[PDB]
Amino acid sequence: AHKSEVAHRFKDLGEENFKALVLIAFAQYLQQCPFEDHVKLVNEVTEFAKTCVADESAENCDKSLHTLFGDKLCTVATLRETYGEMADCCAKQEPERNECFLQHKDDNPNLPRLVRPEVDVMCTAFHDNEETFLKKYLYEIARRHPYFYAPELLFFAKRYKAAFTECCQAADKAACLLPKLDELRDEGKASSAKQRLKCASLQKFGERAFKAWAVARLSQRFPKAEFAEVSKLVTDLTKVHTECCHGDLLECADDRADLAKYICENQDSISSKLKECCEKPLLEKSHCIAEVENDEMPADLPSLAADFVESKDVCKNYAEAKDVFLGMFLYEYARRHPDYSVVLLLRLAKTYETTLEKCCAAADPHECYAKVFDEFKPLVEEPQNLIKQNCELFEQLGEYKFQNALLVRYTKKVPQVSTPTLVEVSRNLGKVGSKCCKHPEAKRMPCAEDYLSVVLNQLCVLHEKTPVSDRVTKCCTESLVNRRPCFSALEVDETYVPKEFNAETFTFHADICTLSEKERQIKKQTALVELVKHKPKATKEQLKAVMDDFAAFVEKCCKADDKETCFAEEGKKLVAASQAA
Ligand SMILES: C[C@](O)(CS(=O)(=O)c1ccc(F)cc1)C(=O)Nc1ccc(C#N)c(C(F)(F)F)c1
């Protein structure tokens, strides 16, 4: 092992990525902390790290990264008045302190909306002080996204920098800049959500849950690779994410760089698709390897029957190494089905596992588990149908109206759920329609189903913060694999007593005329969830009336050029109609 860990990571990562990764670590633990305080702390930690590189036996150079980083964070976090119960983490020592910070990560920090300033003013600040502009980005995203995959946030940290470098020198700065920023915002929300699911799996369901997931996905991605190679990649990938999820970001970034390096040096044994990625710089290389197209599978792969049902050693091999054998099953089933969602492949492996458990205790196990693959049929057909059915509804409704349909459905199922959580989750589910229905069938399932997992997990973690519905808690705690059907099965809450009516939540203001079309949609969708919470028995027919009427007076008052009287009177008609009943 290494004398001085901060020295080892400092020299392995280089100064620039060290400081950026420590700034993220700090920002993801103490989300409410001001930017300038975090930068000062990172500066001190970094100065110290440099004394350790020069001399590894200097005073505190042999402490853990968390002891070093923890103490520095607590110089500003022991402040209970301006923060809160983050002060109690500083009453603990490692490793209990880090565990405390991990458990206090807030998925919905009460933090200001991030308003985007004039392209002209953004561009001025960028040339003025480049480094600080980019630290500000790192900081703002990390405190709002406490599980953002740190190494990818650095890649995320290299691209807006490229965007600003290029677009601030363009003739039309805004035409260059905005679509690049819009695309980075969306893909960043997708990245965050994707990583929250990896962490939720690791932290709540264990390393074994995560590995089976990795075996399934990497076997689809690298179908030419040998099981022993996939297994090695799974081990290295699992160690990387366990570290980031456990707040060991320096180690996480280092072990990821090592893995991308390993992958590119063993390319002929992994995938035929890695060529271009492996010529890119470190950050875009790692990103490219992570998003790479599936390799084409080998041509005439055998049936899998002779290794997993017909063989006389099926029950013996399972007994002697349950986990690598099932891993082998998942490797072989998943390589052959890039058209199956990861979550479907994990269900198939569980059904095979539960079948061996029952049948390897029978008279002749072979006669018991003989028709095992036959039982996969309804498991396979079921996602296919939901997706066919749901994509058809999408085509006749369009994204926006599709979202509204889910808002109404999901509000009736679980009306106790926070309104901003219902809006976000339904809108994002509605984004499955756009992103996945555009595909031919055999590509649809992984796209639609694996993305639902990401979105339902957001629902689970947002609801976990302040739980309000036992049934959501149940679906969220029961399994990972069984989450989508546990949610689909939920029926309309009859027990739910309607909400009283509040004028304010259905009264709008002129400031809505200044918002983008999208924000204005989000506003109407918010009002729509509140409508259903007020009258949950209302018919789809009734709903569309108040919706179209909402649209007309938004239309009418934004073109009324008066004294907010438009948004007042039309907000008084709703207050009068309610006081009357
Ligand atoms: C004017 C400025 O505040 C310059 S800056 O203070 O150095 C800064 C840079 C990046 C930030 F995310 C926040 C603040 C700025 O660029 N702010 C800003 C605010 C919100 C968003 C968003 N979304 C952005 C963007 F660069 F990310 F678009 C930038």
From Swiss-Prot:
PROSITE patterns named in the record: ALBUMIN_1, ALBUMIN_2
Outcome after substituting residue 374 to N: In Nagasaki-2
Positions where N6-methyllysine occurs in the chain: 533
Positions annotated to bind Ca(2+) 2: 12, 254, 258
Cellular component annotations (GO), alphabetically ordered: blood microparticle; cytoplasm; endoplasmic reticulum; endoplasmic reticulum lumen; extracellular exosome; extracellular region; extracellular space; Golgi apparatus
Primary subcellular site in the record, as a coarse category: secreted
Positions of Zn(2+) binding: 66, 246, 248
Binding site for Ca(2+) 1: 5, 243, 248, 251
UniProt PTM: Glycated in diabetic patients.
Mutagenesis / variant outcome for changing residue 81 to K: In Vibo Valentia
Site, as annotated: Aspirin-acetylated lysine: 198
Annotated site (Not glycated): 3, 19, 40, 63, 72, 92, 105, 135, 158, 173, 180, 189, 194, 204, 211, 239, 261, 273, 285, 358, 371, 388, 401, 413, 431, 435, 465, 474, 499, 518, 523, 537, 540, 556, 559, 563, 573
Family recorded in the similarity comment: Belongs to the ALB/AFP/VDB family.
Function (record text): Binds water, Ca(2+), Na(+), K(+), fatty acids, hormones, bilirubin and drugs. Its main function is the regulation of the colloidal osmotic pressure of blood. Major zinc transporter in plasma, typically binds about 80% of all plasma zinc. Major calcium and magnesium transporter in plasma, binds approximately 45% of circulating calcium and magnesium in plasma. Potentially has more than two calcium-binding sites and might additionally bind calcium in a non-specific manner.
Disease implicated: Hyperthyroxinemia, familial dysalbuminemic: A disorder characterized by abnormally elevated levels of total serum thyroxine (T4) in euthyroid patients. It is due to abnormal serum albumin that binds T4 with enhanced affinity.
Protein name, entry field: Albumin
Organism: Homo sapiens (Human)
